[PDB]
Structure formats: structure tokens, C-alpha cells
């Protein structure tokens, strides 16, 4: 995850694709408010073990904003 679109959410998951298909869940922290650029880059580990950087580095952009409840509570507490 890169903010203000910098590498704040590093995580990896080696998953075995069964019938040429793989799926996995990721958990992405967004404690810091702002705009986040999520990038996911697939890599391939062959039978021998050599790692290949094959798959696309597709990215999506996340707009993280503080919830109305917490915002209102903090505003009332500060005011």
C-alpha cells in the first residue's frame, strides 16, 4: 500500500493453485487517513523453487476516511 497517490502494508501469501485457480484473503490496515494505492503483484514459484515475477502488478485506489461516528465524537470531545 502506497499513500498519497509508501509501502505501508507489506504482506505475502504463497498459495497453491489447484485447477489453475487460486484464491486468498488479505487484511489491509488503513489507520492513517487519506488516499491509499493498493498494489498486488503476482509471482510464480516453479516446481524447482525458482521465483518468477510473471503476473500483473494490478493496482486499485482506496479512499480511507474517518467514520461519521468517530469524527462526531472526537469533535464534540474537543469542542
Amino acid at each position: 500500500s502506497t499513500l498519497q497517490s509508501n509501502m505501508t502494508n507489506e504482506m505475502e501469501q504463497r498459495v497453491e493453485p489447484h485447477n489453475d485457480y487460486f484464491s486468498t484473503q488479505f487484511l489491509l490496515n488503513f489507520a492513517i487517513l487519506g488516499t491509499h494505492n493498493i498494489t498486488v503483484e503476482s509471482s510464480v514459484k516453479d516446481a524447482n523453487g525458482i521465483v518468477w515475477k510473471t503476473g500483473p502488478r494490478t493496482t486499485i485506489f482506496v479512499k480511507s476516511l474517518e467514520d461519521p461516528y468517530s469524527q462526531q465524537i472526537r469533535l464534540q470531545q474537543q469542542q
Binding site: 484473503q25 524447482n48 523453487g49 521465483v51
Partner: protein, 823 residues
Amino acid sequence: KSAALHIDLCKATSPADALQYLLQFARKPVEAESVEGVVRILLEHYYKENDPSVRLKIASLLGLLSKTAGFSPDCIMDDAINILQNEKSHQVLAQLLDTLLAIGTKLPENQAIQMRLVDVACKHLTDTSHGVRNKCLQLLGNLGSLDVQKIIGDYFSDQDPRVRTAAIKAMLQLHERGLKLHQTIYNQACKLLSDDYEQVRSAAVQLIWVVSQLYPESIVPIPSSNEEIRLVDDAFGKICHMVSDGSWVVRVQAAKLLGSMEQVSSHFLEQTLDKKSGACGAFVHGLEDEMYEVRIAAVEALCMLAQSSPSFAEKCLDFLVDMFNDEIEEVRLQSIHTMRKISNNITLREDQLDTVLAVLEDSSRDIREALHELLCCTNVSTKEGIHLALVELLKNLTKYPTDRDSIWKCLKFLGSRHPTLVLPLVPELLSTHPFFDTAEPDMDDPAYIAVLVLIFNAAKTCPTMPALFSDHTFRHYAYLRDSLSHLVPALRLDPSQQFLQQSLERVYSLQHLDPQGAQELLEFTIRDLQRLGELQSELAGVADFSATYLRCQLLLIKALQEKLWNVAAPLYLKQSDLASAAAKQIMEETYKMEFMYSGVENKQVVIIHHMRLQAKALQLIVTARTTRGLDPLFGMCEKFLQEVDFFQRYFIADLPHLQDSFVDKLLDLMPRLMTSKPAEVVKILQTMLRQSAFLHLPLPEQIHKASATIIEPAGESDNPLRFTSGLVVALDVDATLEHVQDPQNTVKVQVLYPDGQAQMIHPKPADFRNPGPGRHRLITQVYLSHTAWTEACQVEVRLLLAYNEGTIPFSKPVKVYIMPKPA
């Protein structure tokens, strides 16, 4: 230390500082050979010291030191007895008697020492302090020729009650050591049963039980009545009278000893249950007390007495089944266990079975399983009770799915025993209409499947049952005989080991092949061994062990062929190399063979460690291929050489079995490797690794893989666990662990959240249960917490084995969905 303690005690102030120094010194242990000097210094300071507390602490310490290792205290008992004779204070005298007792117990084979000890105990036995007399009696009990009974017997009349308890305990301990007590002790102990102190009464009833067991058939005359009575019956009456004692501990003791005696006459046994020889209604009063402990003791006593006497068991049936209504959990568990124990000698009545059924509604797992075992062993006389048992079991089938297994087995055992009672109930249960073809019941319905299990186990003994089967009943029977042959009975309607040894011999013999041929042979054999492990259950351990060893060898030779593909160091390419990965894999597999399998003798441990040494050498060489620094290279080189030296030290007796091995040739040129340059060391290590011989792996006679199966969370078809945001959610974990000798210190539970965070859990020993040999059952809760999530992700929970640090997974991972919603 000797001189340090001497000078410290000399310079310290007498009343308090010396006491503090002795307190500090007592904690730390002392080597056996140095005990003589330190006790000599302590004795010297004992002579010097005037304070009573300091002398008391010196006595306690120098008694403690006599228990240290294989030290021989026969040289420190003359000064001890001397200072004991010279000692004035009572606390110090008692502590010195404790020290003398410790020395005597340390030398039981020495006779003359024990005679001296008992003599000096007799000498100080007349002291006014009750503590001194207590320790003297303890000496006479632990140490004594086997006269001493008379000496101890004299103090049954001592004014201090605790001296009386000490005397009775001394006589009991003498009996336990093997001494045959005299019948004269019986009358002395009988007087003590009316003492005003509960400890005296408890010790006295223990002693009267002992003496009755020693002389059961001896005749004792009643004082008033001219009736000649056996001693065991009189003791039975005396103990029965003690079941009404005011203190509950005496009642517990009385019930236990009443259980322990079985030489009593039949009519005396019958008397304790009738309302109205002072043993009338002894168990009646002893089964309905306020205290649960006396009730448990009485229940266990009833178990022993009923096992000894079936005629007594017939009378005890109603009393024991009425106890099932008692609402103390441990009480009802013990009643279940005792009822199961006496089950062979009895058969339940109609109203008694009605009583136990009306209060059979159990909730917890342990009580339910105990009831299942009881029903497995039970004996009933009415088919209506069988119907009610079926009703309750199906209620407990629809209520608890995890109870299905034990209730299927339960009904399997219930029908095998009661075929005659099930025969009317068979058309009552099959719903066979007289003149209509009924609908075919759901073959997946567990209640129905258990009704068939019962009816088929009953049918085994009952020709008349095959008749009343319907058409679908015959169809369903044919299926569950194939699918559940361990529950359903039949009705009236080696090459693996040879292959393993042959494959291993084939691998060992063909070690002259080229690298391609060698590694393809190893791949073939690894695949064969994995398949053989999959097929056979008993040889799964051996096959997986050997296949892991062969996989280590295959990785090693593959890495060496990569090294042959490798070239000069600065041209080395990291992305295309897999030798370091091979070394890491051999590391983890060697750990796996060391710890994740059982029955591993040292002859396999040496081979595992040799392969480990080879992997460490390979890692060293691969690192040297990359690093341009000389100091880290020297550091890893000397670390590896130290590891080799430690291997040689530990396995020194096993080197002749390691001919032509890597470590053998390494040890041949030991000092040259010690004094050579790191680059030269790396080169010769590579050459010696390539020329090393493949060591044979001696198979154990018995070996099983350590396996675990997580069963409680099950598949993810369940709904997500909600309302967890910030707070905690408890996930109940049940698992069966196979062939783990010490699971408590080694088994761990790992929780992996969908982020990089991983949790490691160390279950307490109380979680682990051991229902069978090499087959554990782990039940516990693992606590999960995390912040709020937008969508219900799944958390992976896996069981790991730990070794000593480092851990290795040994269970299949499972996943469960959690939705920590905020509020």
C-alpha cells in the same frame, strides 16, 4: 564454599546476620564431596553459638545437607549425636532429631547406625517437650528392629494428643515397613477411638483397620456378654460406630477402611443397610451426610463390598441408584463408576430403573460419557426401561451430534446383552405397519441408524428377529454391515515389509551410479515409500521416516550438482540457485525425523545428526560462495568446526558405525582443518561432501508418525463468528493427537490472522487428556481478537510441534470465519 562460609559466619553478628547468612546458604546446593568441610564448620559454629534460633537453623541446614546426592553421612553422625546429647533447648533438640532421622533414612542398609539412632531416640523419648517426643516416635517408626512396639505402645496414654497421634502413626509406619504388629495393640487402639481429638480418632481407626486385617479370625470376647466374636467383626462394628463421628474427616476415614475390609461375616454386612453389634444402619447414615466427601467414600466402599459380596450387591442396588439423584457432580460420577464396577453381579429392577431414568437428564460431556459406559456394562430386567433408554438416547442424539459416536457404540453393546427385551420393542421401533408397506426412512437420520444398530446387535443372538424385518430393513442392513461393520454384526439371514526392505537395499546398493541415475532412483524410491505410507497404516511411520531421509539425501546431491553447475564466486547468480534452499530444507526435514516421529533410538539419532552436519557444511559452502567478507567467513567456519567437535564428543561411541561418512573423513583430517585458511577449508569441505558415502539408516522395530487432527471447528460451512471488534472471541479446539510421548511441553497451537500477524499458544497440561496409549485428546479454548473488519475473512488455526527452540507444523490447517462487527 568452605572457608568463605567459615569467615562469613565468624564476622557476622550472632543473633540476626548469621541467621540471614545461613538462610541464604541453605537455598544454594552443595557438592557432595564438600559436604564434610561445611558441616564441620557448621558444627564448630554450633558449639560457639549461644543463640537458640541460630543453632536451630544450623541443625535444620545440616540436616538438609545430608540429603544431597550420593553423599555418605556415616562420618557425620557421631558429632550429630554428641551435640544432640549436649543440646538443651527443645526446638534445637527436635530439629537435631529430624536431622538424625534424615541421616538414618539416608542409610537404611546400615544396621548398627540404626540401632544407635533408635537407642538415642529412646533416650530422649522422656523429654517434656511434645515435639521432642514426636520426633523420637518418628525415629522409632521409620527405624526399628523387625520391644519397639511396647515402647511406642506406652505412649498411647501420653497426655498430649499430638504425641498420641505420633505414636499411632509410628506403629502404622512400622507395620507398613513389614513388621507384624501384636494383637495387644488392638485393645490400646480401641480406647483411643473415644478420644476428644479428631486426629487421634483417625489414627486409631487406621490402626484398628490394620490390626483387624492382620488378625481377622482371632477371637475377642465381649466384656459384658459371654459371646465369642471374631476380631474382624468386632473391628467392623467399631469402625461402623465411627461413621457417626462428629468430625467429617474421621467419617471419611471410617468409610474408606470399611470398604477396605472383606473378611467380615455376611450378617454383619447385611446389618449396615437395615434400619433397626452396633453396626446397624452404618451405610444408611454414611450415605446421606451433609459432606460430599464422606458420601464419595461410602460409595467407593459400597463398590468394594459389593464386588466382594454379590448378595450384598443385591441389597446395595436400590441405595446406590437412589444416590444418582445427588446433585454434586463428583458424587454422581463416582456413583456411575461404582455402579458400572458392580454391574456384573446385579440386574436392575423396574422401579429402580424408573428412578434412575427419571433423573437421567445430563448436560455435561463427562457425565454423559460415563452414563454411556455404564449403559454399555449395565444389566436391566424390563423392556420398558429399554424403551425409555432409547427415548433418552435419541433425545441426546438430536441434542448433541458429537455424542452420536458413543451412543451408537452404546446401543451396539446394549442390544448384544438384551436381545430378549428388544424383541417385543422391535416392531415398536421399526414402525412396521401390519398391512401397509411403510415409507422408507431417511438412511442418513442418526436416530434411525442407531435404532438399526441396536436391533441388529440384538438380532445376532435371536433367530426370531430376522423374521420381523421389513424389506427396507433388509436393504438397510446390507448397507450398514459393509459401511459400519464395527457396529453392525454379521447376521444369519508380509509383502509390505519385504517391499520396504527391498527398496531400501536397492537404494543403498546402487550408490555407484552417476548423479542423474542416483537422483532418479532416489525420486522413484521416495515416491514408492510415500505411496506405501499412504496405503499401510502401521508402516506409515517407517515409510515416512525412510522417505524423509532419502529426501534429505536427494536434496543434498541435487545441491551438489547445482554446485557443479556453479562457477567462480563473483559470477554467482542468486535467482537461479537452489542450494541454500536445499540446505534449509534438509535442516527442517532432519528436525522432522528427530522429533515428529516416535520410537527413535540413538542409532537413528546419530544418522539424523550426521545428515544435519552435512546440511550445515552445505550451508557454510553456499554462504562462502557469496560472501566477500573474510571475518564473517572465519566466524561461520569456526562455528561449523565447533559443531563438528561437539558431534564427535557426543557420539564418540558411534563413530565405528560411520565408516566412509562425511564426519569420519572430516575427523581424520581434524587439526589441518583447524589450522587451515577459510577458503581452503571451504574447498576441501566441498570435495569431501561430494566424496562422502550415503549412510545406512537402521530402521527401528516400532515407529509411528506424530499426527494430529483438528475436529471441532470443522469446515467453513458454519456462519461467521460475530461481535468480536476489539474484544475477544473464544474458539473451542478439540483434537486427537497420535503418538506424541510428551505433548504438553511440545504441542503448540498457532493462529494466523489474515494479516502477517501470527499468534503462538502454549496449552496447559490440563487441556491434554489421555483416553488411550499413544492417543491423546486435546480440549481447550484459544482466544482471538482483532479490530473491525469490513468483510468476514477467515483465520487459519493449526497445531505445531515445538523442539529444543524452533517449531514445525504437524497438523492440517483449518479455517474459520470471524466478523468482528463494531458497536
